[PDB]
Amino acid sequence: MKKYVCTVCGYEYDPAEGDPDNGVKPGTAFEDVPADWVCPICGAPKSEFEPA
Ligand SMILES: [Fe+3]
């Protein structure tokens, strides 16, 4: 599934992995990630990402 890049720090959210230790089990798409989710390495919200 399509990956999103964190505009602030460049961290790339990967659907094929998700963000396990923050509730987002793997295989999850980006529309599908918990609205409250923030970038794990710099805090930015979902609104600050862009399709990679
Ligand atoms: Fe970030």
Flag whether 31 is marked binding: no
In angstroms, what is the span from residue 50 Cα to ligand 1's centroid? 11
Q: Domains of the chain, with CATH numbers? A: 1-52 (2.20.28.10)
Resolution of the structure, angstroms: 2.0
Q: Which two tokens stand for residue 31?
A: 């529309």
Half-sphere exposure for 1 (CA within 13 Å, toward CB): 15
The pairs formed by 38-43 with CB atoms below 8 angstroms and a separation of 24 or more are: 39/6, 39/8, 39/9, 39/11, 39/13, 40/11, 41/6, 41/9, 41/11, 42/6, 42/8, 42/9, 42/11
Half-sphere exposure of 37 (CA within 13 A, CB side): 24
Experimental technique: X-ray
Handedness of CA 46, 17, 51, 39 (dihedral sign): positive
Instruction: Say how many Å lie between the CA of residue 43 and the centre of ligand 1.
Output: 6
**Do the beta carbons of residue 24 and residue 18 sit within 8 Å?**
yes
